[PDB]
Structure formats: C-alpha cells, structure tokens
Design a protein around this ligand. Structure first.
Ligand code: HEM
Ligand code: HEM
Ligand SMILES: *[C@@H]1O[C@H](CO)[C@@H](O[C@@H]2O[C@H](CO)[C@@H](O[C@H]3O[C@H](CO)[C@@H](O)[C@H](O)[C@@H]3O)[C@H](O)[C@H]2NC(C)=O)[C@H](O)[C@H]1NC(C)=O
Ligand SMILES: *[C@@H]1O[C@H](CO)[C@@H](O[C@@H]2O[C@H](CO)[C@@H](O[C@H]3O[C@H](CO)[C@@H](O)[C@H](O)[C@@H]3O)[C@H](O)[C@H]2NC(C)=O)[C@H](O)[C@H]1NC(C)=O
Ligand SMILES: *[C@@H]1O[C@H](CO)[C@@H](O[C@@H]2O[C@H](CO)[C@@H](O)[C@H](O)[C@H]2NC(C)=O)[C@H](O)[C@H]1NC(C)=O
Ligand SMILES: *[C@@H]1O[C@H](CO)[C@@H](O[C@@H]2O[C@H](CO)[C@@H](O)[C@H](O)[C@H]2NC(C)=O)[C@H](O)[C@H]1NC(C)=O
Ligand SMILES: *[C@@H]1O[C@H](CO)[C@@H](O[C@@H]2O[C@H](CO)[C@@H](O)[C@H](O)[C@H]2NC(C)=O)[C@H](O)[C@H]1NC(C)=O
Ligand SMILES: *[C@@H]1O[C@H](CO)[C@@H](O[C@@H]2O[C@H](CO)[C@@H](O)[C@H](O)[C@H]2NC(C)=O)[C@H](O)[C@H]1NC(C)=O
Ligand SMILES: *[C@@H]1O[C@H](CO)[C@@H](O)[C@H](O)[C@H]1NC(C)=O
Ligand SMILES: *[C@@H]1O[C@H](CO)[C@@H](O)[C@H](O)[C@H]1NC(C)=O
Ligand SMILES: [Ca+2]
Ligand SMILES: [Ca+2]
Lengths: 595, 595
C-alpha cells in the first residue's frame, strides 16, 4: 500500500520542454518523473530509517531506552574520548594541497543541505534550549559528560536543533521521518546560481542587457569583484569584528561565509561567470542577456563536473574508482539521481582534513607580515579579513602552496573545529563539530556501522577482536566499544572514518562505497551531464577537456606562477610555472553564425 | 461545567480532618473538595476568557488584528488622556482617614497574588525587554505614545512581563489560559503567617516554647518588635539608599515592604501575635509552644475578618451591602470560595485612593520634623525611614489623623503612581501603575466592560449618548471612546472605575457588584469563618465582638490618644480619646482548666 502520509510546499514548475537549459529549482531533468532530483524534497533512503520509537525520535532521547540493549554514549564523550588530539606536529597530508579540502566542501555544498529548524525569528523557545538545556520538541541538546572542561566555562550543554523534515516541521507525525534537501542533487553549480528562482534573480545584474551576476558596488580587489553583501541585519559576519562592520557575502548558497577560504572560491566562481558572459557577448554580439546568462551557467557547470570527476574524485576513492564509477556510457533515464541521507554523513570525512591554521602568502609565496598565519578558529564567518586585508589573492596562494591535514586514527578533528566552532545563531566560539556530526546522525535516523558495512558487502564484525581486524588497530578498536559496547551501535560518521584508508585514496572501504555509488548516480542520471550527446557539441566538448582549476586562478586574480596539478603537494620555486604554460578554454566554438 | 484539568506542581497534603486549626496552605478547608480555595491554584473564572487568538495572546499585542473591528488603545495613551491630573488640591476625601486606604491594601494582599513570570537566573532576556522593547512570549511591552514626556527621558517603552499561568511556567498549548493565585483565598491573615509549609515555619521563632513569630535581632523600636530583614542580595530596600543600607522586611507575604505605610501595619500585625501568644501563655501555663501559634493565629485571623466586614466593607459598598452581602446564615459548603480573576482588577479601585504625600506626626499630632511631609514616590520600598528615621509611631499617628484620596472622575491616579512608580526588579523611578493595570487586563484575558455590566444585570450602553447617561459626565464619555471607539472595548478596570459612586459608599454600581459577590463568597464558603459554630465558643465570640483597630494601635505602640472610629475623618484632638476609653478584648474565655 501507499500510506503516503502528507505533501509539500514546493515551487511548482511546468518544465519548458525542448530547452537546452537547466532549471533553477532542478525540475525536469527527468521526463518521466520531473520533481525527481529537485530541491526541497526529502533526502532518499537506501536503508530503512532507524529511530527509537521506530518512527521519529532519535536514539539517545529517552535515556531510559536503549538500542540493541545498550545506552548510546553521549555525543560529546565520543568526541573527547576518541576524536580529539593536542599536538599538531606533523599531522599534515603530504601529497594534498589545501585546495584538496576546499574543493571538497564546495562539491558537498552543491549537492546537499538539510535546513535546521527554527521557527522563531522574534522567539524564546529558541532560548529554552540555549539557556536551560531542556529536551522537548525540536530542541535536542548535546549534554556534557563529567569533568568536561567546557563545564566550568560555557554551561551544561550545547544548544542543538533537529533538521527539518518533509511536510511542515512544526507539531510532526504519521510515517517514518525523512529530512529535506533544500538544494539540487546535480553537479550544476547551484551554489553559484541558487536553488529557488526567487533568489536566482536577486543574484543578477538585470539592468545591463548583457547577462551578469550581481556584484558588490562598495568593495573592491584590484579592480576585481567580490560577491554582493548580504542584506538582512543581525548577520554574524558583522558580530565577529563589531568595529570593522563588514557583513557576509551573499551567494546562490547560504553557507558561503562559514570560513574565509570558502568565501574565497565563491569569488572565483562568481568571477568566472563574468569573464565568460562578457567574452561570449563580444563573440556573439547579437546574443541577448538571458541567452548569455545561461550559456555561461552551462559552461560553468560543465566545469564543476570535470574538475570534480577528473581531478578530484580519483584521488579520494583512489584505487576504488574503476570499481564504482565505471567509464561513462550515456543517459540512463532510469537511475535515482537523488542524494541518499547517508551520503550527507559519508561526505563529512573532509571534516577530518581541515588544518588548524590558514596562512596568507605574499607575491613570492612568502609568509607576509606579522599576522599572515591565523588560527582556523578566528576565521568562521569572517569577511573583513578579506575586504580589509589584502583581498583574496594572498588566500588563494595559501590554498595552492600550503597542505591539508591528513586523517590519522589518533588525530581525527582539530580542536579549532572540535572546541571553538562558531554557530551563526549563537555568540560563543565554543561549539563542537564532531559532537554535532554525531547527534545529527541520530537525528536523521541512520542505521549503524554494521548495517552499512552490510549494504556494501564487507564483514559485519561483532567481536572486539573482530573490530580490530577491520580497523587494524587495537586501542582504537577498544576505546571505541568501551563506549558503544558492540559494533552494531557505532555511529556511521565515526565508525566509517575509523577505518584505514584504501590504497592511494583518502577514505576507507565503506566510505569509498557510499561515495562511489552516490557520485555515479548523479552522473549517470543527469540528463545534462556534459559528455551526454546533445548537451554540448563535439567541438564544444573538445575545448572543455582543457579546463583546469589552475587556469581558473590565472584568469581571475593577479597570481602569475601556478601549479599544473593544483590538487597535489607543491613546494614554491619548482613546481610552479608562469600561467602561459597552461591551457586556456577556447570559447571559439560557441560562436554562432547567422546565415 | 463539571470536567477535568492540568494538575501542575502543588504542595500535596493529607487532611487531618479534626484539627481545630486552619492549614497554612489553605488546603482541606472544604471537605468534599480539598483544594478549593488553596494557594497556587489558578483563579476562579466567572466569564469566558477573551484573548485575541481565543487562547493566550493579549488584545493589543498583534499590531493588526482588532477587537470587535477596532484597534485597542495603547496602555499608556489611556493614562495620559484620562487617568492623570496635575493639581493635587482639593482631591482629599473629607470623611475617610488615610487608614481606610491602607486597610484596603491589606485585605487585598490576604486574598490574591498573580506572580508575574519569569526570572531567568542570569538572563539575557530581561535585557531584551528593558532596552530594545521587543515583543516576545514573556515580554509584552508598554509602548510610549507620540509626544509623550517619558520619550525624551526614559526611552521607548517600559518593561512588562505577562503573569504566571498554570500548567507550565515556561512555553506551550491546548486550553484557555488562566493565572495563578499564590495566596490562600480565605480571609485568614496569611500575609502574616505565609502560604507555604516551609516559609510558614522559618517565619517563626522555634528557638523557644513560647510559640512566637521570629523578630529582628539587629534593630528595635523603643523596646518593641520589628519584622526580620530579608536575606536576598540585590535587595530593592538597600538600593534606595546605599548609605543607610537597610534591607527589606521579611513577612508572611512578599509585597510587605512596597511602601512605608504597608510595611507599617505589617508590624502592628506581627506584634499583635507575639502579644497573644505571650498573653495566652500566662493564662494557660501548660500549653504548647505549638498550641500557642494557631490559638493565637486563630485569634488573629478572626480579628482581620471582623474589621473587614464590620467597619470596612460597610463603608466601601455603602447602600449596596445589604443587596449583595446578606446576614450570615451559616456555612454554605456548596459555595466556591476561590477568588475570581476579575476581583483582582475590581479591587484595584483602591489605587485611586492613594494621596500624593505621606506624613509623619509628633506626639501632639503636629508635623514632626524639618521633613515631616514626604512625597510618596520616595517611599516605595523604603525601610530606613522607619528603622532609622523615627519608628512606626510617627507613621501610625499619620494614618489615624490624615485623609485618603477621594476618587474623582477627573483626578484618577496620583502622579507619584502614574509617572514615578518604583518596581523592585528595575532601577529607575519612572513606571506607571495605571498603564500596568490596563496592560495587565489584556494579559489576564479580561472580558470587555459591557460584558460585565451585563453579568451584573445592568444597562449596556452602545452609543456615546449611551455612555454619558451612566457616567453622568459627557466630556469623559467622549474622551473614553474617542479612544475605545466602542463601549464594548473599554478595559474593565477603568470603565469600572469610571462610573460615579454609589450612596454612602466608595465604588460605582458595577464594582459594587463584583466586590460584593466576591466577599460574600469567601465568607459563606470558609468552614472556619468565625461566626460559624464550632470554630469559636459562644463566650469566645462575645469577646471578639469588641476587637477594634484603635485597640490594636494601643496594645502595640506608645500612642495613648486614638479615635473610636479609626476609619473615618478624625481631627485632633476632639475626635481622639485616651486608650483607656476603648475596650480591651478579654482573653479570659480562652482559659482552659485541667479536669
Ligand atoms: C568550518 C567548516 C568546514 C571547514 C573547516 C567544513 C568543511 C567541509 C568539507 C571539506 C566537506 C566535504 C568535502 C564538508 C561536508 C559537509 N559539511 Fe562541513 N564544514 C564546516 C562547518 C559546518 C557546519 C556548522 C555544518 C552543519 C552541521 C550540521 O549538521 O548541523 C557543516 C555541515 C556539512 C555538511 C551537511 C550538508 C547538509 O546535509 O546540509 C556536509 C556534507 N559544516 N564540510
Ligand atoms: C504602591 C502601591 C500602593 C500604595 C500606594 C497600592 C495600593 C493598593 C490598595 C489601597 C488596594 C485596595 C484597596 C490595592 C489593590 C491592589 N493592588 Fe495595589 N498598590 C501599589 C502598587 C501595586 C503594583 C505594582 C501592583 C501590581 C500591578 C500589576 O497588575 O502588575 C499592585 C496590584 C494590586 C492588585 C492586584 C492583585 C493581583 O491580582 O495580583 C490589587 C487588588 N499594586 N492596591
Ligand atoms: C577589527 O577589524 C579591523 C578592520 O577594520 C582591524 O583593524 C586593523 O588591524 C590593525 C590593528 O592592529 C591595523 O592593520 C595592520 O596590522 C599589521 C601589523 O600588525 C600590518 O601588517 C597590516 O598591513 C595592517 O596595516 C589597522 O590599523 C587596523 N585598522 C583599524 C581601522 O583598526 C582590527 O584588527 C580588528 N579588531 C579586532 C579585535 O578584531
Ligand atoms: C541616605 O540615608 C541616610 C540615612 O541612613 C540619610 O542620612 C541621614 O540624614 C542626615 C545626613 O545627611 C542626618 O540627619 C541630620 O542630622 C543632624 C540632626 O540631628 C543635622 O544637623 C544634619 O544636617 C542632618 O540633616 C542623619 O543622621 C543621616 N542618617 C544617617 C544614618 O547617617 C541620607 O539623607 C540618605 N540619602 C538620600 C539621597 O536619600
Ligand atoms: C601524489 O599524487 C599524484 C596524483 O595522483 C600522484 O601522481 C599520479 O600517479 C598516478 C599513478 O600512481 C598516475 O596515474 C598519474 O600520472 C599521476 N597524476 C599526476 C597528476 O601526477 C603521485 O604519484 C603522488 N606522489 C607520491 C610521492 O606518491
Ligand atoms: C552592472 O553592470 C554594469 C555594466 O558594466 C556596471 O556598470 C559599470 O560599472 C563599472 C565599475 O563599477 C564602471 O567602471 C562603468 O562605468 C559602468 N559601466 C557603465 C556602462 O555604466 C554595474 O556596476 C553593474 N552593477 C552590478 C550590481 O553588478
Ligand atoms: C463619614 O462617613 C460615615 C459612613 O458613611 C458616616 O457614618 C454615618 O453617619 C451618619 C450621620 O451623619 C449616620 O447615618 C450613621 O449613624 C453613621 N454610620 C456609621 C457607620 O458611622 C459618618 O457619620 C460620616 N461623617 C458624618 C459627620 O456623618
Ligand atoms: C526567640 O524567643 C526567645 C524566648 O524569649 C527570645 O529569648 C529572650 O530574648 C529576650 C529579648 O531579647 C532576652 O532578654 C532574653 O535573655 C532571652 N531569653 C532566652 C531564654 O533566650 C529570643 O530573643 C527570640 N529570638 C528571636 C529571633 O525571636
Ligand atoms: C541503465 O539501465 C539500462 C536498462 O536496464 C541498462 O542497460 C543498464 O544497466 C544501465 N546503463 C548504464 C550505462 O548504466
Ligand atoms: C447555598 O448556596 C447555594 C449555591 O449557590 C444556593 O442554592 C443557596 O443560595 C444557598 N442556600 C441557602 C439555604 O442559603
Ligand atoms: Ca546542485
Ligand atoms: Ca488568605
């Protein structure tokens, strides 16, 4: 039967039909099922939801209940007992640029986003959670264990809310809970253009009839632009440095400002749009604005798919790609292009690759000034360090020359992320990303480590001597279940990352499986995948295989010497070459001849 | 309506059932229904709650919904246009002592306390209501009209927190909201003995046999008692004058020290008890420390009741007393003894009987001192002016010799109360009792004015020519609805207080009703009312029939000249006689004898 409980707000689009262009909402990619893969629809489930009341309450809610006959360890304890580490000494991946984790957070962002629930924009229930730590309704506090340093400093807990679900979000019911994905499952640069038409036009210079993205009129970077400042007052980017008074940037996506390096690449993508539109305009003079805006948007998306599948995914899945992402072979009209719930917890591995400091290099890539080397922690929702401090050129260099953190079984998440996190809703710099990642698993109802090791075809260990075989490490295998008590209860985020990394990759057996599949599907089920016949022509493609992130730099900044392979470890004199040694993306084929 | 309801936090006890003594909590009075009339229950309702969303948002909080098709007047605006005046001359009630005014406030405090809501305990939210004046779930501001003084001087609005409701304290749903009465509904002098098991005890000197209430050990008044100071740091009493640094008095009821005059009678009471206990002890040598309290505590309540129904009510109601309060025909157990909500707004008529200043007289009832007449406003929460500047003797001569404030359709409430009211919570001296009152009606869900004229079975005016016939004042009737636009929307408090006084009484036909009905009720449903058989003996009564407030003054102060009728006007020295001229209350009939 179909006890299809309740429905949906949803921008209802009617498709065009023959149009050679992508819709904003994400609809119509599919002819037999339109809304399949669009924004604001429940995340998909590869495996049945696992809640305490089997229907919607998270494990670790009604203390006096267990799973599989045990008490689920507090989120914050899992973090301390197993996730943290004090000494940053030589904890850096050595064949991976910082760019390697920045491009990650970007592709993640183009694929998913489960809105937190906040009804409340005047509200004090908003406060019964930050100030009293009382579980009830959407408030699901992250309690602290004994002798947790935070206790003498911030309170009894860390405010935390449940992720919105389909249908409303308020007085919730009926069938097994499924949370929403407010973005589009396609690598369609929807972080640059948006997911709701309403906002996709706000982003637009629509007074000049030459298709351009709206840009800042009050701030500059050597005659180069920054995204437009966001409207809404009580923005956090202002709070950080009350004096400076420079707000967050506004982009197709709403997380663009979390950290100064994220904002930076958001600027390159915004910038590449314009070089492309202007260019096309000059070549196809008769072309009209709307035509420019989308031929550009199309060029750009092709870009995010080629960098992502040619340069980025090989080196994550490593030797497990050929196995999961077979070589492309046409639109498989019948493949779920949607993002599964788990994916959004399996692609969080990146969290473990964020270094504890971001540095600014000066034209010869030398640490510039008295404060070129800052703490990751003083960079969340920070834009003034950009507007009022050298622009983003010195930051882009950092990304090219400095390396990312390497996932170490006994150095998982830097404290800058596990102890001093800034949440846009709050005032302190004392939240924890690891703990959040852990309850958030429970909020969404994920099944356990074993039920997932299963989904992939790997042994489901039960003996502590068994966990050791997989994790290839005793003391980790031990600390782990002195907490969970059984392999069947370990949270996927942690349980997955605990595994050693596959050959020449950056994630193990289970993560490789969950990512591999997901990615293949949004690539085989996307009607606009660039390589699929019709979306572009033989000659347009030929020109597209020559793009590179290195080239992206050369055309939108004043950097001059850059690496051929922006994603691997590169020292400054040798591994760098002046831009004229690198391919250019010939937009000639885009030329349209009249008669 | 015979149905179920929210059974929230209430001290639970077991009815002994044959104890000749009232419980402190008020519980067990009623045999068939225990709770009835108990403290911390929430207020009898005589009419439907009227709220804007039919459940809990005050009328006039959502800035666009109406009442009966019309916008509700700002709380403060009514106060400026109607309630206030600038000449305090000729405003004195020629035939009513200041004491009149004062006994009314004692009888009220014995009957009802609706706690306003929250505190927080280190809160960022008390701050969001006294700075930005932002509306929000517990904070319902009082906004300042345009062209109002307070604007230039205090700010945008003055703080106001809705009053406590019954299932919760914090935030939620389903039934018409009701406020809590934290004091026993019977006239049992519990402003003295308290309404809580735990406080009730602490308030007594258990370090002796003698069964007495504990007195202050740091300061005495000419060899006489004072109540003990209150622990509470961030005390209002000390803030007034830091140099003096004299804390608030601790009494059976919180408000005990809002003003020098109230805190005063609060001592005569306290002293009355210790006397009785002491006295009883010698006539009954073998009694118990414990038997001493409540034989006295019984003697005391009975005292309140008498003065209230016998010298006091007969002059508030006047020719409407027989109509509502017939002669006692004994305990009618089928009568709801609880205080209705409206009573708590009907009784505030006394807010308009407070004169502009408070005096201090020398033993010849001559102004005593360089600063005898003190403007009222510098007396809210004042204690040092007692303990340190004179004693209570000078004040009590004040009450007996000075006059109250006559209610006058033109001068409603003193400016010492309209503009300069002090609240314990906050710092400045610029609040408005009148505006609090009006705001407070909408908070308590008070049905409109007409909905009450009807309830008492009186003409309901619809037109302006209609409202003039009742108020017997054209101009007023006009000012009133140039603001309310319709008789239906006039806030009870004012509308009630607007009607011209009844014969030989001090309230209009409406209030006469409300107040008459309420009082009769707490008297006919109180199993312990004194005239009731069993409660006190035939002889015991015959001796209680002579208690007088003049005698109270005598036995417990060093005043020797007092009037027979302490409630009306009395000029010195013709209306004053020697304390030897007034009766004494013989306790000989309380003499128990062995076999
Ligand atoms: C600071 C934060 C980052 C940089 C130090 C960072 C980085 C990444 C990378 C590199 C990712 C994948 C390659 C990635 C995936 C996802 N993140 Fe994370 N992130 C920072 C801070 C946050 C915060 C706060 C959140 C919200 C967490 C919550 O669940 O409440 C966050 C989330 C995510 C996320 C969820 C997307 C979604 O489903 O809505 C990823 C897939 N990041 N991040
Ligand atoms: C100062 C205050 C007084 C002295 C000038 C004063 C006096 C009286 C008298 C004489 C009353 C009866 C004849 C009387 C009744 C009630 N009051 Fe009032 N009062 C002073 C100050 C206040 C403040 C502040 C309040 C709270 C107002 C609010 O609505 O928030 C107050 C209340 C009341 C009240 C309500 C009891 C209740 O239902 O909770 C009376 C019946 N007074 N007062
Ligand atoms: C708040 O944001 C301010 C930006 O508007 C920032 O002010 C600037 O920072 C420093 C003050 O210490 C000065 O800048 C110089 O600092 C180093 C030397 O330490 C130089 O190498 C740099 O080139 C740079 O010129 C600026 O004078 C100052 N500007 C202003 C207006 O103060 C503050 O640092 C921020 N304050 C906080 C607490 O975050
Ligand atoms: C703060 O409270 C003080 C009382 O605790 C009060 O001071 C009192 O008033 C004056 C001191 O200024 C003294 O009274 C008079 O004393 C002799 C008469 O005997 C006169 O010659 C003096 O000039 C003075 O007028 C009291 O002794 C003094 N009380 C105490 C305990 O010191 C202040 O007036 C109060 N301040 C405010 C702002 O209210
Ligand atoms: C660092 O990573 C690079 C990137 O993969 C490695 O070079 C690749 O090596 C594989 C075979 O192992 C080849 O398919 C490619 O020709 C190489 N790609 C690039 C971009 O160079 C390199 O071997 C790694 N460095 C070390 C020391 O292992
Ligand atoms: C929209 O596009 C127009 C066209 O370029 C922008 O106007 C130019 O702005 C630059 C720098 O701000 C000036 O040097 C030129 O003089 C302007 N050109 C013309 C023809 O007026 C405009 O700034 C853009 N606005 C937004 C919000 O992006
Ligand atoms: C002041 O008010 C009281 C009560 O209203 C008056 O009391 C009545 O006075 C008249 C004499 O004029 C008689 O009807 C009664 O004997 C009194 N009853 C009471 C309870 O006192 C009082 O007398 C008024 N002042 C004057 C001079 O009448
Ligand atoms: C509690 O009651 C006792 C019993 O009388 C009080 O004790 C006497 O207090 C007087 C007055 O200060 C002293 O002169 C006596 O010396 C005390 N006698 C005894 C046996 O203690 C006591 O002061 C009272 N305390 C309180 C706080 O009320
Ligand atoms: C797509 O589905 C078809 C239909 O069953 C099948 O030929 C094949 O498994 C899929 N093709 C690709 C390229 O994935
Ligand atoms: C007792 O109260 C009941 C209920 O209000 C009422 O019927 C009647 O007035 C009273 N009975 C007598 C005999 O007075
Ligand atoms: Ca997308
Ligand atoms: Ca009482």
């Amino acid at each position: 039967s179909w006890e299809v409980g309740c429905g949906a707000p949803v921008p209802l689009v009617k498709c065009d039909e023959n149009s050679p262009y992508r819709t904003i909402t994400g609809d119509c990619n599919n002819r037999r099922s339109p809304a399949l893969g669009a924004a604001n629809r429940a995340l998909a489930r590869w495996l049945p939801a696992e809640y305490e009341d089997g229907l919607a309450v998270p494990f670790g809610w009604t203390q006096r209940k267990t799973r599989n006959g045990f008490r689920v360890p507090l989120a914050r304890e899992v973090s301390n007992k197993i996730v943290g580490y004090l000494d940053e000494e030589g904890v850096l991946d050595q064949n991976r640029s910082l760019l390697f984790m920045q491009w990650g957070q970007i592709v993640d962002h183009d694929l998913d986003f489960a809105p937190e629930t906040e009804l409340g924009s005047s509200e004090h229930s908003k406060v019964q959670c930050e100030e009293y730590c009382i579980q009830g309704d959407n408030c699901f506090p992250i309690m602290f264990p004994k002798n947790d340093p935070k206790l003498k400093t911030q309170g009894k807990c860390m405010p935390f809310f449940r992720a919105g679900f389909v249908c409303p979000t308020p007085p919730y019911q009926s069938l097994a809970r499924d949370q929403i994905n407010s973005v589009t499952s396609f690598l369609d640069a929807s972080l640059v253009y948006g997911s709701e038409p309403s906002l996709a036009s706000r982003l637009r210079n629509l007074s000049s009839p030459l298709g351009l993205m709206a840009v800042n009129q009050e701030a500059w970077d050597h005659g180069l632009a920054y995204p437009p400042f966001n409207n809404m007052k009580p923005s956090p980017c202002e709070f950080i440095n009350t004096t400076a008074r420079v707000p967050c940037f506004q982009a197709g996506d709403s997380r663009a400002s979390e950290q100064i390096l994220l904002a930076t690449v958001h600027t390159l993508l915004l910038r590449e749009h314009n070089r492309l539109a202007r260019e096309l305009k000059r070549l196809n003079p008769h072309w009209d604005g709307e035509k420019l805006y989308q031929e550009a948007r199309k060029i750009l998306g092709a870009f995010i798919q080629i960098i992502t599948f040619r340069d980025y995914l090989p080196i994550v899945l490593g030797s497990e790609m050929q196995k999961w992402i077979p070589r492309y072979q046409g639109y498989n009209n019948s493949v779920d292009p949607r993002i599964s719930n788990v994916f959004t917890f399996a692609f969080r591995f990146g969290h473990m690759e964020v270094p504890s400091t971001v540095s600014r290099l000066d034209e010869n890539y030398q640490p510039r000034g008295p404060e070129a080397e800052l703490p990751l922690h003083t960079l969340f929702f920070n834009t003034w360090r950009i507007i009022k401090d050298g622009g983003i050129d010195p930051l882009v260099r950092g990304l090219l020359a400095k390396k990312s953190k390497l996932m170490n079984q006994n150095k998982m998440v830097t404290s800058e992320l596990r102890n001093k996190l800034f949440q846009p809703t709050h005032k302190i710099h004392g939240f924890d990303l690891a703990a959040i990642n852990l309850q958030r698993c429970r909020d969404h109802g994920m099944p356990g480590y074993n039920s997932w090791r299963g989904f992939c075809g790997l042994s489901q260990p039960k003996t502590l001597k068994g966990l050791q075989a997989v994790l290839k490490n005793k003391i980790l295998a031990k600390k782990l279940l002195d907490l969970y008590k059984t392999p069947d209860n370990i949270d996927i985020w942690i349980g997955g990352n605990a595994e050693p990394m596959v050959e020449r990759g950056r994630v193990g057996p289970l993560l490789a499986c969950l990512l591999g599949r997901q990615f293949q599907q949004i690539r085989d089920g996307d009607r606009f995948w660039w390589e699929n016949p019709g979306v572009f022509t033989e000659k347009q493609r030929d020109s597209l295989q020559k793009v590179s992130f290195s080239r992206l730099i050369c055309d939108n900044t004043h950097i001059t010497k850059v690496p051929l392979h922006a994603f691997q470890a590169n020292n400054y004199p040798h591994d760098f070459v002046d831009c004229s040694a690198i391919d250019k993306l010939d937009l000639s084929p885009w030329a349209s001849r009249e008669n």
